[PDB]
Every structure is written in structure tokens, then in C-alpha cells.
Design a protein around this motif. Structure first.
Motif, PDB file in Angstrom:
ATOM      1  N   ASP A   1      32.952  36.632  75.865  1.00 23.30           N
ATOM      2  CA  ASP A   1      33.532  37.227  77.060  1.00 23.30           C
ATOM      3  C   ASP A   1      34.212  36.218  77.971  1.00 23.30           C
ATOM      4  OD1 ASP A   1      33.730  38.850  79.678  1.00 23.30           O
ATOM      5  OD2 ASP A   1      32.787  40.291  78.318  1.00 23.30           O
ATOM      6  N   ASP A   2      33.758  34.967  77.984  1.00 21.57           N
ATOM      7  CA  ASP A   2      34.362  33.906  78.781  1.00 21.57           C
ATOM      8  C   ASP A   2      34.935  32.861  77.830  1.00 21.57           C
ATOM      9  OD1 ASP A   2      34.667  32.642  81.599  1.00 21.57           O
ATOM     10  OD2 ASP A   2      33.725  31.042  80.429  1.00 21.57           O
ATOM     11  N   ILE A   3      36.246  32.673  77.882  1.00 16.78           N
ATOM     12  CA  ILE A   3      36.897  31.671  77.031  1.00 16.78           C
ATOM     13  C   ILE A   3      36.466  30.279  77.481  1.00 16.78           C
ATOM     14  CG2 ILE A   3      39.105  30.638  76.437  1.00 16.78           C
ATOM     15  CD1 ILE A   3      38.502  33.198  74.945  1.00 16.78           C
ATOM     16  N   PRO A   4      36.054  29.396  76.566  1.00 13.55           N
ATOM     17  CA  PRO A   4      35.588  28.067  76.983  1.00 13.55           C
ATOM     18  C   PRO A   4      36.715  27.179  77.481  1.00 13.55           C
ATOM     19  CG  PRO A   4      35.670  28.210  74.599  1.00 13.55           C
ATOM     20  CD  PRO A   4      35.933  29.597  75.111  1.00 13.55           C
ATOM     21  N   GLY A   5      36.354  26.035  78.062  1.00 12.82           N
ATOM     22  CA  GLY A   5      37.333  25.087  78.554  1.00 12.82           C
ATOM     23  C   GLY A   5      36.926  23.679  78.184  1.00 12.82           C
ATOM     24  N   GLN A   6      37.829  22.736  78.466  1.00 12.29           N
ATOM     25  CA  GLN A   6      37.573  21.345  78.107  1.00 12.29           C
ATOM     26  C   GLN A   6      36.331  20.813  78.811  1.00 12.29           C
ATOM     27  OE1 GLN A   6      37.904  18.220  79.869  1.00 12.29           O
ATOM     28  NE2 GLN A   6      37.458  17.069  77.993  1.00 12.29           N
ATOM     29  N   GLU A   7      36.193  21.097  80.108  1.00 10.60           N
ATOM     30  CA  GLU A   7      35.012  20.648  80.836  1.00 10.60           C
ATOM     31  C   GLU A   7      33.759  21.383  80.381  1.00 10.60           C
ATOM     32  OE1 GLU A   7      37.829  21.572  82.297  1.00 10.60           O
ATOM     33  OE2 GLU A   7      38.617  19.761  83.254  1.00 10.60           O
ATOM     34  N   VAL A   8      33.914  22.602  79.859  1.00  9.11           N
ATOM     35  CA  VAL A   8      32.760  23.384  79.421  1.00  9.11           C
ATOM     36  C   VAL A   8      32.069  22.706  78.243  1.00  9.11           C
ATOM     37  CG1 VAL A   8      32.010  25.603  78.520  1.00  9.11           C
ATOM     38  CG2 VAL A   8      33.742  25.514  80.312  1.00  9.11           C
ATOM     39  N   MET A   9      32.844  22.301  77.233  1.00  9.18           N
ATOM     40  CA  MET A   9      32.252  21.661  76.064  1.00  9.18           C
ATOM     41  C   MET A   9      31.702  20.272  76.355  1.00  9.18           C
ATOM     42  SD  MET A   9      35.844  21.879  74.077  1.00  9.18           S
ATOM     43  CE  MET A   9      35.914  23.611  74.523  1.00  9.18           C
ATOM     44  N   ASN A  10      32.082  19.649  77.474  1.00 13.16           N
ATOM     45  CA  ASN A  10      31.401  18.429  77.889  1.00 13.16           C
ATOM     46  C   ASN A  10      29.952  18.692  78.273  1.00 13.16           C
ATOM     47  OD1 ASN A  10      34.523  17.818  79.201  1.00 13.16           O
ATOM     48  ND2 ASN A  10      33.609  16.329  77.794  1.00 13.16           N
ATOM     49  N   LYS A  11      29.609  19.940  78.591  1.00 17.01           N
ATOM     50  CA  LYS A  11      28.250  20.317  78.937  1.00 17.01           C
ATOM     51  C   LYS A  11      27.689  21.432  78.067  1.00 17.01           C
ATOM     52  CE  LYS A  11      29.346  17.568  82.246  1.00 17.01           C
ATOM     53  NZ  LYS A  11      29.923  18.277  83.421  1.00 17.01           N
ATOM     54  N   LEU A  12      28.505  22.059  77.222  1.00 17.48           N
ATOM     55  CA  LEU A  12      28.058  23.172  76.393  1.00 17.48           C
ATOM     56  C   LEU A  12      28.475  23.079  74.934  1.00 17.48           C
ATOM     57  CD1 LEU A  12      28.394  26.422  78.545  1.00 17.48           C
ATOM     58  CD2 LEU A  12      26.394  24.996  78.079  1.00 17.48           C
ATOM     59  N   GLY A  13      29.385  22.173  74.572  1.00 19.34           N
ATOM     60  CA  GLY A  13      29.853  22.108  73.198  1.00 19.34           C
ATOM     61  C   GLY A  13      28.766  21.742  72.209  1.00 19.34           C
ATOM     62  N   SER A  14      27.838  20.872  72.612  1.00 17.67           N
ATOM     63  CA  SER A  14      26.750  20.485  71.722  1.00 17.67           C
ATOM     64  C   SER A  14      25.871  21.680  71.371  1.00 17.67           C
ATOM     65  CB  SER A  14      25.916  19.376  72.364  1.00 17.67           C
ATOM     66  OG  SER A  14      25.274  19.839  73.538  1.00 17.67           O
ATOM     67  N   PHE A  15      25.560  22.523  72.359  1.00 14.92           N
ATOM     68  CA  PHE A  15      24.742  23.701  72.093  1.00 14.92           C
ATOM     69  C   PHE A  15      25.456  24.688  71.177  1.00 14.92           C
ATOM     70  CE2 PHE A  15      23.935  22.080  76.381  1.00 14.92           C
ATOM     71  CZ  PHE A  15      22.610  21.712  76.263  1.00 14.92           C
ATOM     72  N   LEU A  16      26.783  24.780  71.282  1.00 18.81           N
ATOM     73  CA  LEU A  16      27.532  25.703  70.435  1.00 18.81           C
ATOM     74  C   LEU A  16      27.477  25.284  68.970  1.00 18.81           C
ATOM     75  CD1 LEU A  16      29.081  28.283  70.596  1.00 18.81           C
ATOM     76  CD2 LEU A  16      31.184  26.991  71.013  1.00 18.81           C
ATOM     77  N   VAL A  17      27.540  23.983  68.699  1.00 24.82           N
ATOM     78  CA  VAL A  17      27.573  23.517  67.318  1.00 24.82           C
ATOM     79  C   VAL A  17      26.174  23.328  66.733  1.00 24.82           C
ATOM     80  CG1 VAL A  17      29.857  22.499  67.515  1.00 24.82           C
ATOM     81  CG2 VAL A  17      27.845  21.153  68.138  1.00 24.82           C
ATOM     82  N   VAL A  18      25.192  22.956  67.556  1.00 28.83           N
ATOM     83  CA  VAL A  18      23.848  22.706  67.043  1.00 28.83           C
ATOM     84  C   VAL A  18      23.199  24.006  66.579  1.00 28.83           C
ATOM     85  CG1 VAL A  18      21.511  22.137  67.781  1.00 28.83           C
ATOM     86  CG2 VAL A  18      23.375  20.523  68.189  1.00 28.83           C
ATOM     87  N   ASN A  19      23.287  25.056  67.396  1.00 27.34           N
ATOM     88  CA  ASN A  19      22.575  26.301  67.127  1.00 27.34           C
ATOM     89  C   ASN A  19      23.501  27.409  66.631  1.00 27.34           C
ATOM     90  OD1 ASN A  19      21.636  29.138  68.479  1.00 27.34           O
ATOM     91  ND2 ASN A  19      19.867  27.989  67.709  1.00 27.34           N
ATOM     92  N   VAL A  20      24.546  27.728  67.397  1.00 30.54           N
ATOM     93  CA  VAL A  20      25.388  28.873  67.065  1.00 30.54           C
ATOM     94  C   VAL A  20      26.188  28.608  65.795  1.00 30.54           C
ATOM     95  CG1 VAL A  20      27.260  30.345  67.869  1.00 30.54           C
ATOM     96  CG2 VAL A  20      25.484  29.598  69.469  1.00 30.54           C
ATOM     97  N   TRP A  21      26.822  27.436  65.710  1.00 26.27           N
ATOM     98  CA  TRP A  21      27.702  27.153  64.581  1.00 26.27           C
ATOM     99  C   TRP A  21      26.928  26.991  63.279  1.00 26.27           C
ATOM    100  CZ3 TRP A  21      32.905  27.372  64.208  1.00 26.27           C
ATOM    101  CH2 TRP A  21      33.500  26.808  63.073  1.00 26.27           C
ATOM    102  N   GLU A  22      25.676  26.532  63.352  1.00 25.07           N
ATOM    103  CA  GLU A  22      24.893  26.325  62.139  1.00 25.07           C
ATOM    104  C   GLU A  22      24.653  27.636  61.402  1.00 25.07           C
ATOM    105  OE1 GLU A  22      23.932  23.675  60.308  1.00 25.07           O
ATOM    106  OE2 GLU A  22      23.379  25.360  59.015  1.00 25.07           O
ATOM    107  N   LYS A  23      24.329  28.701  62.137  1.00 28.88           N
ATOM    108  CA  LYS A  23      24.080  29.990  61.504  1.00 28.88           C
ATOM    109  C   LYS A  23      25.359  30.649  61.005  1.00 28.88           C
ATOM    110  CE  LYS A  23      20.308  30.789  62.101  1.00 28.88           C
ATOM    111  NZ  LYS A  23      19.120  30.260  61.376  1.00 28.88           N
ATOM    112  N   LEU A  24      26.518  30.257  61.539  1.00 26.39           N
ATOM    113  CA  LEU A  24      27.769  30.890  61.136  1.00 26.39           C
ATOM    114  C   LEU A  24      28.193  30.453  59.738  1.00 26.39           C
ATOM    115  CD1 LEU A  24      29.743  30.659  64.501  1.00 26.39           C
ATOM    116  CD2 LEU A  24      28.635  32.678  63.511  1.00 26.39           C
ATOM    117  N   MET A  25      27.998  29.174  59.409  1.00 21.21           N
ATOM    118  CA  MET A  25      28.431  28.649  58.119  1.00 21.21           C
ATOM    119  C   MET A  25      27.623  29.194  56.951  1.00 21.21           C
ATOM    120  SD  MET A  25      31.063  26.837  58.717  1.00 21.21           S
ATOM    121  CE  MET A  25      31.437  28.099  59.934  1.00 21.21           C
ATOM    122  N   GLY A  26      26.480  29.823  57.209  1.00 27.71           N
ATOM    123  CA  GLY A  26      25.695  30.428  56.156  1.00 27.71           C
ATOM    124  C   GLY A  26      26.129  31.815  55.749  1.00 27.71           C
TER     125      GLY A  26
END
Length: 1080
Positions: free
Chosen positions: A87-112
Motif C-alpha cells: 500500500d505504501d511505495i518504498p523510498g531510498q531512505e526507507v530501505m536504509n531502515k527497512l530494506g534489511s527486514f524486507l530481504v531477510v524475512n519477506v524475500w526469503e519466503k518469496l523465492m521458494g
């Protein structure tokens, strides 16, 4: 509207138009324009309409995780499918504080998950810096590519998407597929997310088309309340599971073809072209197909194209004792139609066993009254038929022309892989009704399967002809195989099983049989009656045509077999397929033309004014170069040609009397009256003698007539020695054909043009005993004067074959070349006398060449003069070197024996630079060896200046001994060859060039070396090419004959013969054999 003037300033839709709107500036009390609530809705239908812009709206660390977590829900769905929401499009400053959480947890389940789906329906607004990363996560590659057209006014820089390598972990696999989801609530930021993917073609779009507006809309809030700006400064609910259904089908599209390849090549029925089939089966692309309906369309088109049999069965759209003989006589009805014609009607074929066990009643009821019928008609229009097991039994009764057993049709079954021959059952309990008199089948569009097979088999064997509409084409020899049915899919495939090769060996694909009379089903009976009426007189027309052809044809040898063939065809009844007079006439023409070899035979059904006319008919002019251009547009008269006499001779003929060259334009002459042609021909020949032009053979007179030139017609005769040219085209008439033949046979002209078809010297249409038919046949023929053979029967063969438009230019070129011939001969003779090996022989050639003027006066065209001049020169001089045309290895053998081989020549200046190189190259390995072997059997040739270097290198230093005197005609002197201040044997062959053997020659004179091999090629010194004034002649002149030899008998022409003859391949083996022994 003060904000609008500065934020939005794009000239593509403004060019400063809002500056007039800017003139309103404050405008706080302009309600007189429109009341408060609207006047923004008015502007919605106002300026926004004029703007043509994408919509305009005016009105009157865990904390970040918590907010973002509610915006997505990821889980593994059935079919191993992942779902993504945002619902909220991310931004450059967002992934400086949220990008790690997106790839550690959310992205891991997507590749399966095998398939991924992303949702953008609820996306409303966001920043722009977030889009380069979402594509980067999705993009499998690492190379940076930019394809985008978007610009931000405050940034003043155009923006293009960049796939940054900033992502952490493995990227999305290129094999798996993704689909985007959108709706009306999708924001602008999410709109370009799908836009780039669609252009990338990596993903696919499902659902309603989005707005497609600006990615972001600038917001501003001023005043008290009630309105915040959304200016664009920056320039279906069921689709959630619809893609899942697409994915499930896409999950089976890897397996949609595995079964298709299995069922297609089960047996030989459908895979007659299997090398092409199996290759194309894996060629279908699974990305192109996006829907079940689209899958049907693409598979059907591909299957038909590869098999090259579209009409055959292909893929189909998916799915969602009293009563006994009473019945026997009831099913089959027979009536005696007036005129002694039997009428038969069928309703159902029943079964072969039923007919076999009920046969006696059936025959006793149907054939007892049908035996006396002269002709029989079958009405199977109302007959679906059904099973085709009884088809051969019915075909047995009609024995056909040959009572002996014969195969009718060959059937092959895919399931059993058995080819069965259906012979004519000769043990039937019937009267064996004969096909003589003809049997007619009335077929409607409802023949279905069994009746349609019976009709097609009747038509193929020629025992019957079909009258009525075309058939339905439906066939029961087809099995529908199940193919990939799951839930609501229900795909189905139908594949033919039977081949049914006919007697001709051509497989019948099926789908409908064309009758011989396409008439309405209701009107079938009257048409069949009319055909009965016409077919009763078929023999009379054929007999009359044969008699007429025998009576009035010019060539009886053709008739002797034409009559027999027509009678044989009539007896068998091959013309029964003719339904009307015109078709019969066309068939007769085809037969006569195909077997007689003649295409002219054809049969079908039913004062001042004189001066003006003659000037309009003729086109008389004297072209430059003293040559006439008399044209005969149309002259096919008999006696008016000699009736006009002087009034035309003085006006036309007397003008071209002294042309010295005459050209006849017969390209445009449809005249076809070979009546007074010899009178015209008599002008060109000599007056006093009686020249036999040609002999004409007349069938009616039944003897050969002779045609002679008129002894005297006028005092102006063209002349025998003066040339003549005739131009013929494809539209030339018959008279021009006779003129061309009679000028070509006597060798008086030079026909230039394209071949013309159709002689037709004199044709007369004759009527057969019946009115509607007329026969057109050539009642005349001409025999040549030189030999008794008839003319070519197909037209003249011009000596020069050029299109009729360019014929005149070719004639001009021919006459120019003929004029140029004597000068070419004179200068060629002078050149040969000037330069040649023997001055006296060249003078003799020049003297004798001047006597060939008569032979060269009739040259056909260019490039033949060159070859004939070459032949004349080569017969004049025994040297075969007079042509005309038109537009380093070193080895040491066994037993201390050296070897040398070379076949290319270079100039002494060229060898001077490489002279130092060869000293340490070819001489280093042979300085110590006892014996040397040299080979030049493959010599190509070159200048003779290198001879001195070869002798000087071989010979030791000392006083010069080499002696060679050569007459150099270009030098006008003789030059002596001088050398520059063990054992060896030459290896020669026929392939040695003319520049090779002089090396061998000088070796044998001094006695230093001996020669082994076979006879040389008899070459010569390198000829010096010469150019004649004509651009087409390149004369090569041998010179520098070796004369210094004491004997005076040159090696030229005869060549050099060694002492012992050995084969070239064995010469090298024989090269070292004696060297070993002489050193042994």
C-alpha cells in the motif's frame, strides 16, 4: 489558482497558456463565473478538457516495521504460489531502515514459490526513488539498462529507470513467471511499475486497464480548509484468482505437448510427414499463450501448417416370415421411370451381416425389375447411411468394363496397422448389372458417411457420375482422444484414423466430394433426366469428330492413331463425366491437343482515300545508316495486292529501292492469309531463275503442290546481295510465319525476335453432323524446299532471342557490326603480320586472311565473330596459342639425396628482394647433399627473365657458357642469353606451363642433366595481349620463338619428350631410384 502558474510549466500542453489563467492571480470573488462548490468541477470539464492532461483534481526502528507490515501479506499458496501486497511505495531512505527486514524475512519466503503475483490495486501514492529497486529485485540480470521517459520539473533532469545492483541476495530467476494486478484505485507510482514490466515483457498484465496517468501528483494546502491541491507536476475484482487459473494452465503448458507428441505419432496414418511434425511440436512458445481460448487458436494454426493438411481433422475447441420381407420391400423402393430407366432410393445401409442374411429377398425385390433397365439412377439424397461395412458388397454388382476381378480401394487402419485390399466380390448371387448405359447418383448435402463413401468410390472408378449438390463431408472414421481435462478445462483432440488410399494411389483426405453437375438438391431429378437425354447421343458426336478429322486433316499419320484412340475412349466410356456440350468440347480439345502433338486443332461450341488508307497502314522511313524500316501493319490480301500495283509501289517501294539494307517490321502483323506471300518473296531473289521457295501439301487435293517465284512482276527488284532483316514477335500472324520460314530455309535473312506460337497456314471450320459443335482444323501444310519434312509446327526459332521492344536496337547493332567486320579483319591481319613468332608465316596469314571476306559477311551477332576468328587463326597457324576473347620447398631424400620443388614464377626485380632469403632457405639444405632432384610438374608460368637467375644459381662461377638466341619481334632484333657472373634430373609432366619447359630445354642441350617424365604441354612464350579498335576483340600473339638452336626445329607446339616415359605420380618415386643406383 496562483499555485498553478509556477508548478506546472510543460510546453507540450501549455506553451504559456495558463499565463492567461495566471492573469486571474488572486481571483477570490469570481463566484459570478460559477458558484463555490463547482467552478472546479466546471474547470474539470473546462481547462482540464483543454489541457488533455492525465486527470486534474480541484476541490472547494520497529515503528516503520509496524506500519509497513500491515501493507503486505506473504504466504505460499497452492500450486507453490507466492502472493505479495503493498500500500505504501518504498523510498531510498526507507530501505536504509527497512530494506534489511524486507530481504531477510519477506524475500526469503518469496523465492521458494514457483510463481509470484504482486498486487497494486490498493497502491495510492509514494515517492519516486523506490521504483529502481523493485525492478532490480525482479530483474534477473545484473547489467544496468535504462528504458523510461519521465521527467520531474523541480529536478530539471529527465528520469530513466536504472536496475541498480544494490539488492542483497539472489535475484529473481528468469525461468519463473510473474503477473501484475491492478484496479481503478491503483496509484500513479504503481502504474509505471507495470508499464516498465509490460515493455520489458518479463511479466504479464491481468485485470482492467489502469488509469495510466502521472506517477505522482504534487500536493499543497492553503487557505482555511475544504481543499488541498493534487496538481500533476511530475510527468475486475475477480482478477485475484484469474491469474491463478492462468498460472495453473501455465503450470501444465510444459506438459501440454508431451501428450500431443504421444498421440500424434501412434501409427502411420497421420505421421506420413513425421520428420517435419515432431520437429515443430516443440517449437510452440509457452509465453505467447496466455489463455485457454488463445491456446486453442495457436495450437490449431501450428498443427495445420506443419502437416500441410489443414482440411484434415485437427484440434477442437475445449468442451464445457412376413414382417422380415415386408421391411425388406419397405426399405428399398424401385420404380420403372418412363423411358426404361430404373429408379432406386436408399434410406439406410443397415449392416453387412443383415444384408448377407436377408439377401435373397433383397435381390428378388430390387434386381428382378431392375434387370431390364437401359439406364439406372440412384437417389441417395435422404440417406445418412451409417456403417460402411457393406460398401464393397454393393460395389460388386456393378462389374464395370472388365469382368475380371480388380482392386477397388485400399484401406489402412491406424489401430491395427493393417492394409487390406478390397477385391471385387465375384461370388454374388445376382445378375451382375453392367455399368454400360451409365448409372447416376443423386447426392444432396446430407449424404453423411456411408452414402458419401459409396458416391466417392463410384466417381473415382469412373463407373458413375454425380448429379446434385456437394456432400456434407462428415466422416465416421475419426476417434476423439481425451487431452488434458482438469476442472473446467475439458480440452479435446480429434485425430483421423483411416487413410483410404484410392486406386490411383492418392490418399483421400476427405471433407466433401465435388459432383459433376452442381445443381440444387430439389432440381436434381430434372437435371439428371436432362443428362440422360444428352448422354444418349454421346457416341454420335465422337464418331462425327473422328470422321471429320479423317476427312479434312493435313497429316494422315496423326489421324491413323487419332481415330483409334477416340474410338477406344468412346468404347470404354471416359466421356461420361461430361455433363454439357461445352465440357465435352473442352475435353475433346484437350485429348486431341495432348495426343496429336498439335495445338492449332480446336473444337468450340457455336484516289485520296486510297492514299490516306495506305499511309495509315504503312510506316516507311529511312533510319540513319542507310537502312530501311518498312512496316507491314496488316497485309493479308489475295489479288488487290497486285491490283493496286504502281499507286503503292511508287509511293512506298520506290522510296526504299536504294536503301542498301532493308528491315521488315513484322512484329505487328495479325495478317493470316498465306495466299499471295510468294509474290512478295519473288522480289528479293534473282529474276531469271525459277527458285523453288517451298512446297505445300493439300489434303483435299491429296498431292504435293510446288510454289515458284514469279518470273516478272515489276521492274524494281531489291537485289540478291543486299542484306535483309525480319523482326517477329509473339503476336505475329500466320503470313509473317510463312515469310520467316521461307526466308530462313533459303538463308536470305536473319530473323531477330522472340519465338512465335501457332503456324495455322490455312484453317477452315467444319461442322459435325450435330449443329452445336464445330471443329477448327488445319486443312493445309507446307514442306520445306531443302528437305521434305514439314515445318516446325510451333513457329520460327529466331537466331537472336530478344524481347520485341528491344529488337530494333539489336538489328542496328547487328548491321553496325557487319559494317565493321572488314576493318576488323584488315587490322587483325596487319597486327598478326606485324607481331608473330615467324615473320614470314605472319605475312602469309595476313595475305590469306584477306580472302575470308565472304565467310565473315554473315556473322550472326557479337561474340561469335570472336570464336570463329579464333578457329580461322588456329587453322591458319599450327600454333594453338592464338586465342581471341570478348568482354619454394626444400627436402633431403634418403641416401644423401637432395630435393627441390617449385611451381610459381616471379619477376627478377621481385626475386631480387627475396634473393638473400633463399640463400639460407633452399641452398642451406642442399649445399652438402650428393644429388639433387627438381620437380616442376605443376608449374603455373611466368616471365622468362627469371631463367638467367636459375641457370646462374645452379651453375658454378666461371666464364659464361649459356647460349640462347631468340628472335624478339617487338624488339625487332635477336637477344643472347648470358648467365650472371654432381647430378640432377628434371621431373616434368603435361601440366607444366609454357614458361617451364625452356628450363628443361636448356638443361638437355649442354648435357649437364637428363630429363625424366612424359611429354610436355607444347606451350609457348608468355603471350602479349592486344586490343583491336573494336572493344570485343582481345588477340593474343605468341612471340619470342627460340631459334638459336642449331637444328632449327623448335620445341614449340610439339613439346618436349623425355627419354623414358613414366606416370607423374610414379615419376617422383622413379626420380630417386636411379640416383641411388648411380651412387650405389
Amino acid at each position: 489558482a496562483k499555485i498553478l502558474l509556477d508548478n506546472y510549466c510543460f510546453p507540450e500542453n501549455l506553451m504559456g497558456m495558463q499565463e492567461a489563467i495566471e492573469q486571474a492571480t488572486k481571483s477570490p470573488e469570481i463566484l459570478a463565473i460559477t458558484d463555490p462548490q463547482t467552478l472546479a468541477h466546471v474547470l474539470t470539464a473546462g481547462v482540464q478538457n483543454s489541457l488533455n492532461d492525465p486527470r486534474l483534481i480541484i476541490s472547494y526502528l520497529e515503528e516503520l516495521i509496524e506500519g509497513l507490515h500491515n501493507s503486505l501479506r506473504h504466504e505460499v499458496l497452492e500450486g507453490n504460489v507466492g502472493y505479495l501486497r503493498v500500500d505504501d511505495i518504498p523510498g531510498q531512505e526507507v530501505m536504509n531502515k527497512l530494506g534489511s527486514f524486507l530481504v531477510v524475512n519477506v524475500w526469503e519466503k518469496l523465492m521458494g514459490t514457483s510463481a509470484l503475483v504482486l498486487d497494486l490495486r490498493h497502491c495510492t501514492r509514494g515517492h519516486v526513488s523506490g521504483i529502481p529497486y523493485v525492478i532490480s529485485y525482479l530483474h534477473p540480470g545484473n547489467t544496468v539498462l535504462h528504458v523510461d521517459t519521465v521527467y520531474d520539473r523541480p529536478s530539471n533532469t529527465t528520469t530513466e529507470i536504472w536496475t541498480l545492483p544494490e539488492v542483497l541476495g539472489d535475484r529473481y530467476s528468469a525461468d519463473k513467471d510473474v503477473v501484475v494486478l491492478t484496479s481503478s484505485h491503483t496509484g500513479g507510482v504503481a502504474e509505471d511499475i507495470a508499464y516498465i514490466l509490460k515493455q520489458m515483457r518479463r511479466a504479464i498484465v491481468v485485470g482492467e486497464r489502469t488509469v495510466g496517468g502521472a506517477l505522482d501528483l504534487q500536493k499543497l494546502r492553503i487557505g482555511q480548509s475544504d481543499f488541498f491541491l493534487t496538481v500533476p507536476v511530475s510527468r475486475a475484482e475477480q482478477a485475484l484468482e484469474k491469474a491463478l487459473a492462468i498460472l495453473k494452465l501455465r503450470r501444465a503448458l510444459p506438459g501440454v505437448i508431451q501428450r500431443l507428441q504421444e498421440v500424434l505419432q501412434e501409427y502411420y496414418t497421420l505421421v506420413d510427414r513425421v520428420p517435419a511434425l515432431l520437429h515443430h511440436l516443440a517449437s510452440m512458445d509457452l509465453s505467447s499463450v496466455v489463455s485457454e481460448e488463445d491456446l486453442v487458436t495457436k495450437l490449431n494454426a501450428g498443427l495445420q501448417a506443419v502437416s500441410e493438411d489443414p482440411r484434415l481433422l485437427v484440434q477442437v475447441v475445449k468442451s464445457k416370415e412376413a414382417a422380415r420381407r415386408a421391411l425388406v420391400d419397405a426399405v428399398f423402393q424401385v420404380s420403372v421411370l418412363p423411358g426404361n430407366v430404373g429408379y432406386l432410393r436408399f434410406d439406410s445401409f443397415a449392416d453387412a451381416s443383415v444384408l448377407g442374411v436377408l439377401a435373397p429377398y433383397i435381390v428378388h425385390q430390387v434386381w428382378e425389375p431392375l434387370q431390364d433397365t437401359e439406364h439406372l439412377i440412384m437417389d441417395l439424397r435422404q440417406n445418412p447411411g451409417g456403417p460402411s461395412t457393406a460398401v464393397p458388397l454393393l460395389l460388386s454388382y456393378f462389374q464395370g468394363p472388365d469382368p475380371g476381378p480388380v482392386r477397388l480401394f485400399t484401406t489402412y487402419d491406424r489401430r491395427t496397422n493393417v492394409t487390406q485390399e478390397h477385391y471385387s466380390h465375384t461370388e454374388l448371387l445376382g445378375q451382375r448389372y453392367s455399368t454400360q448405359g451409365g448409372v447416376y447418383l443423386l447426392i444432396s448435402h446430407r449424404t453423411a458417411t456411408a452414402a458419401e463413401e459409396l458416391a466417392f468410390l463410384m466417381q473415382s472408378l469412373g463407373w458413375a457420375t454425380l448429379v446434385g449438390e456437394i456432400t456434407a463431408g462428415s466422416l465416421l472414421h475419426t476417434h476423439t482422444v481425451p487431452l488434458l481435462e482438469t476442472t473446467e478445462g475439458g480440452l479435446s483432440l480429434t485425430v483421423p484414423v483411416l487413410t483410404f488410399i484410392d486406386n490411383h494411389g492418392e490418399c483421400w483426405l476427405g471433407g466433401g466430394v465435388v459432383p459433376d453437375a452442381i445443381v440444387l438438391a430439389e432440381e436434381a431429378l430434372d437435371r439428371a433426366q436432362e443428362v440422360l437425354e444428352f448422354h444418349r447421343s454421346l457416341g454420335e458426336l465422337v464418331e462425327g469428330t473422328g470422321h471429320l478429322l479423317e476427312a479434312h486433316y493435313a497429316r494422315p499419320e496423326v489421324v491413323g492413331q487419332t481415330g483409334a484412340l477416340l474410338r477406344a475412349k468412346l468404347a470404354q466410356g471416359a466421356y461420361r463425366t461430361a455433363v454439357d456440350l461445352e465440357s465435352l468440347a473442352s475435353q475433346l480439345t484437350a485429348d486431341l491437343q495432348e495426343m496429336s502433338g498439335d495445338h492449332r486443332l480446336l473444337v468450340f461450341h457455336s484516289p485520296e482515300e486510297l492514299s490516306y488508307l495506305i499511309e495509315a497502314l504503312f510506316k516507311t522511313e529511312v533510319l540513319p545508316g542507310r537502312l530501311g524500316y518498312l512496316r507491314f501493319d496488316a497485309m493479308a490480301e489475295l489479288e488487290t495486292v497486285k491490283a493496286i500495283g504502281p499507286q503503292l509501289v511508287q509511293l512506298v517501294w520506290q522510296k526504299l529501292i536504294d536503301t542498301a539494307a532493308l528491315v521488315v517490321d513484322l512484329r505487328y502483323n495479325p495478317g493470316s492469309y498465306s495466299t499471295a506471300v510468294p509474290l512478295l518473296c519473288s522480289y528479293f531473289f534473282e529474276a531469271e531463275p525459277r527458285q523453288h521457295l517451298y512446297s505445300v501439301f493439300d489434303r483435299a487435293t491429296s498431292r504435293v503442290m510446288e510454289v515458284w517465284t514469279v518470273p516478272q512482276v515489276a521492274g524494281q527488284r531489291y537485289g540478291p546481295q543486299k542484306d535483309l532483316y525480319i523482326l517477329v514477335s509473339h503476336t505475329s500472324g500466320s503470313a509473317a510465319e510463312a515469310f520467316a520460314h521461307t526466308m530462313q530455309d533459303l538463308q536470305r535473312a536473319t530473323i531477330i525476335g522472340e519465338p512465335t506460337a501457332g503456324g495455322a497456314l490455312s484453317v477452315g471450320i467444319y461442322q459435325v453432323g450435330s449443329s452445336p459443335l464445330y471443329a477448327s482444323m488445319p486443312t493445309q501444310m507446307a514442306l520445306s524446299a531443302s528437305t521434305g519434312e514439314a515445318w516446325d509446327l510451333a513457329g520460327v526459332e529466331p537466331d537472336i532471342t530478344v524481347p520485341m521492344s528491344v529488337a530494333l536496337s539489336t538489328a542496328r547493332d547487328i548491321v553496325a557490326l557487319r559494317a565493321k567486320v572488314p576493318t576488323v579483319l584488315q587490322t587483325a591481319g596487319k597486327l598478326v603480320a606485324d607481331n608473330y613468332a615467324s615473320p614470314e608465316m605472319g605475312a602469309k596469314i595476313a595475305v590469306k586472311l584477306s580472302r575470308l571476306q565472304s565467310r565473315y559477311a554473315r556473322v550472326t551477332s557479337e561474340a561469335s565473330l570472336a570464336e570463329m576468328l579464333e578457329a580461322d587463326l588456329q587453322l591458319l597457324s599450327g600454333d594453338p596459342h592464338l586465342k581471341t576473347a570478348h568482354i619454394f620447398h626444400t627436402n633431403v631424400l634418403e641416401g644423401n639425396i637432395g630435393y627441390l620443388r617449385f611451381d610459381m614464377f616471379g619477376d627478377r626485380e621481385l626475386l631480387t628482394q627475396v634473393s638473400e632469403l633463399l640463400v639460407e632457405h633452399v641452398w642451406k639444405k642442399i649445399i652438402h647433399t650428393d644429388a639433387l632432384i627438381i620437380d616442376m610438374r605443376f608449374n603455373i608460368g611466368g616471365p622468362t627473365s627469371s631463367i638467367s637467375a636459375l641457370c646462374s644459381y645452379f651453375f658454378d662461377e666461371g666464364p659464361p657458357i649459356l647460349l640462347d638466341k631468340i628472335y624478339n619481334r617487338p624488339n625487332d632484333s635477336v637477344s643472347e642469353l648470358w648467365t650472371h657472373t654432381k647430378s640432377i634430373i628434371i621431373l616434368t609432366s603435361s601440366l607444366t606451363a609454357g614458361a617451364a619447359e625452356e628450363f628443361t630445354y636448356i638443361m638437355k642441350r649442354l648435357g649437364r642433366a637428363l630429363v625424366i617424365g612424359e611429354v610436355t604441354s607444347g606451350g609457348s612464350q608468355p603471350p602479349q595481349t592486344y586490343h583491336v579498335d573494336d572493344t570485343n576483340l582481345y588477340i593474343t600473339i605468341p612471340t619470342a620463338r627460340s631459334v638459336g638452336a642449331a637444328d632449327g626445329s623448335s620445341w614449340e607446339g610439339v613439346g618436349v619428350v623425355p627419354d623414358v616415359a613414366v606416370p607423374a605420380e610414379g615419376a617422383l618415386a622413379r626420380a630417386q631410384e636411379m640416383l641411388q643406383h648411380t651412387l650405389l
